[PDB]
Design a protein around this ligand. Structure first.
Ligand SMILES: NC(=O)C1=CN([C@@H]2O[C@H](COP(=O)(O)OP(=O)(O)OC[C@H]3O[C@@H](n4cnc5c(N)ncnc54)[C@H](OP(=O)(O)O)[C@@H]3O)[C@@H](O)[C@H]2O)C=CC1
Ligand SMILES: NC(=O)C1=CN([C@@H]2O[C@H](COP(=O)(O)OP(=O)(O)OC[C@H]3O[C@@H](n4cnc5c(N)ncnc54)[C@H](OP(=O)(O)O)[C@@H]3O)[C@@H](O)[C@H]2O)C=CC1
Ligand SMILES: N[C@@H](C[C@H]1CC(C(=O)O)=NO1)C(=O)O
Lengths: 320, 320
């Protein structure tokens, strides 16, 4: 009767965080990890991503943890055919297309696919919509960092020549304070964030790599970008942590009265929080299937209570 | 296009706030105000609350704005038989009961009743359940203010000699900082908030009044209190407003990694923001009725997109 049979697809940072965190769940059993690699450092059973079809009946929801920049678009739709799915796809300009192709696959299989979960997209997306809906007349801005962005970091490593790479998003603190006072209108995220890259690569490949970085669509174009090529020794010791966070600020006026809505996240480890978010929506995905639903849904489409491990009545009697 | 026809029951501060705000809604038409009083200071049509049945067909959703104390529990169910209803009922300990009773009336009439909307019962409820869901093991606290506490203000006003008074509940800056780092597990309610009083009275009574305040049990004893005796002119110009707000702070450890989720609300006028929320949910109740649902629902059971005046598609392409 109880217990969601879960499985991870892609054993990177995010993949390792969801494996770790499934242990804190009272209703989930990790059945295994589907990977492109043969030897993983874990006691959890490893399967070939190609043998997913063979495990279709013993898995309720697959947690997609492959790279957004190149893996998700091509691979994601494939898995929706075998079980419910949850991803953290973050290329915003590509979300409507992704939602459509995942809906096709999920609807045909009778499954539920929760797309673009996490904190951004994910929690920040939900907040943007709530604050904007409530405050008719409003101004809204999202700030990231300072911290390590997993999507931009992975995008850098797919560039040939890049041995090791990491990217930090640096927000304009000046603009963040202006937002709080409702005086940052017309200012965009591309204008309030700097992107600094720390890359380890052969000197000969520098020019090319730098070109591919500054011209990469969505992740980098239109942003101020600093590229640093550093010694591998310095990399392995200075760039090991994965902190991050952000602020979604919304101000509104009701006729001579201002209101400020602020959602803040201070994450010690980006992979871990993202993984916690993904797991919660994994629970909702499954519950939605149990109730007769199918297709791809964004975070804006699931009622909040579906994420909780506790039943509705307990939440209504304690948290409302 | 179609345009949702709305009516306001009860014309207090909340009712006044929803009235002026509907003018800002792109899809709502105000049909009238159902009041117990015949002559209101407004251009909008006023109708006897006993004649709601006579207008049952001219209205889509009724914004219930009477007092929570006694009005909502006895009157609210009766209105649910005429149209969709939205209330901001804040008696936390009575919510499960109010929901069950409203669900009986709403289901019978085939309507949708959205109960307990607003900011604490409302936005804060949504956030509590969200952050608690995501962060498996966690600590959670909610702080109110700075804001005018009617309960404590009234305690101040019944002191002999007090001409005018008001009390502001402020969050302890020390306590907020501790909750942010997950160190507030041992803090008591008398340690999480400070109390600031503004009393107008003859100087001859200042010493006795200050003592009456500082020793008043259940309201100020054990708390850190601040008393200020101001001029009546300073009172009328600076303490007639209705500010409020609060902080919802949640933390969680993921294996030596801490995460902080903080939701902040700074409101210049309490009833104005409450009205904004109540209105957004009125749109949601109407859309839910169009989709074939009925019965009563809390803010935890409605999907975020349902509150927005935009198309789901525009939302997905722009805010996710
Ligand atoms: N929406 C949101 O708020 C958030 C989204 N994200 C997203 O998370 C995604 C994942 O980032 P992250 O997990 O840190 O990236 P990693 O590069 O660490 O993991 C990516 C993929 O690379 C593979 N791989 C991993 N290690 C190696 C290795 N050592 N040698 C060769 N191949 C390897 C994996 O597949 P395999 O094991 O099969 O080989 C893994 O699935 C990003 O694309 C980003 O978009 C992250 C945070 C938040
Ligand atoms: N959930 C949340 O976050 C929040 C909830 N609340 C809730 O909303 C409610 C707000 O009501 P609010 O408008 O502040 O209170 P009021 O006392 O101003 O209004 C209450 C009722 O009294 C009546 N009445 C109003 N003015 C007068 C008058 N001058 N003379 C005599 N009768 C009058 C009205 O009915 P009629 O017109 O029929 O006479 C009105 O419906 C509260 O009860 C509270 O529970 C408020 C803020 C936030
Ligand atoms: N998508 C991000 C999560 C947040 C952080 C971010 C950025 O720094 O630009 N954008 O969104 C990630 O993969 O880590």
């Amino acid at each position: 009767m109880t217990n969601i049979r879960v499985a991870i697809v892609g054993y990177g940072n995010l993949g390792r965080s969801v494996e770790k965190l499934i242990a804190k769940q009272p209703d989930m059993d990790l059945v295994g990890i589907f990977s492109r690699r043969a030897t993983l450092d874990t006691k959890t059973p490893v399967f070939d991503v190609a043998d997913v079809d063979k495990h279709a009946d013993d898995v309720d929801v697959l947690f997609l943890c492959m790279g957004s920049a190149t893996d998700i678009p091509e691979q994601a739709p494939k898995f929706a055919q075998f079980a419910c799915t949850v991803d953290t796809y973050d290329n915003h300009r590509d979300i409507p297309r992704h939602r459509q192709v995942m809906n096709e696959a999920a609807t045909a299989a009778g499954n539920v696919a929760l797309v673009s979960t996490g904190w951004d997209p994910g929690m920040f997306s939900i907040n943007r919509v709530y604050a904007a809906a409530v405050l008719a007349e409003h101004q809204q801005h999202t700030f990231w960092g300072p911290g390590l962005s997993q999507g931009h970091s992975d995008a850098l490593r797919r560039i040939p020549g890049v041995q090791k790479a990491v990217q930090y998003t640096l927000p304009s603190e000046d603009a963040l304070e202006k937002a709080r006072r409702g005086e940052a209108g017309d200012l965009t995220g591309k204008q309030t964030h700097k992107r600094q890259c720390f890359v380890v690569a052969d000197a000969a490949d520098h020019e090319r790599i730098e070109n591919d970085i500054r011209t990469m669509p969505d992740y980098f174009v239109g942003y101020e970008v600093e590229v640093n090529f550093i010694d591998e020794a310095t990399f392995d010791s200075e760039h090991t942590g994965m902190p991050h966070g952000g602020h979604v600020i919304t101000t509104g006026d009701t006729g001579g009265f201002n209101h400020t809505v602020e959602y803040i996240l201070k994450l010690d480890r980006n992979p871990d929080f993202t993984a916690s978010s993904q797991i919660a929506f994994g629970r909702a995905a499954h519950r939605m299937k149990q109730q007769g639903q199918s297709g791809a849904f964004t975070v804006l489409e699931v009622a909040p209570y579906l994420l909780s491990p506790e039943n509705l009545d307990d939440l209504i009697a304690r948290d409302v």
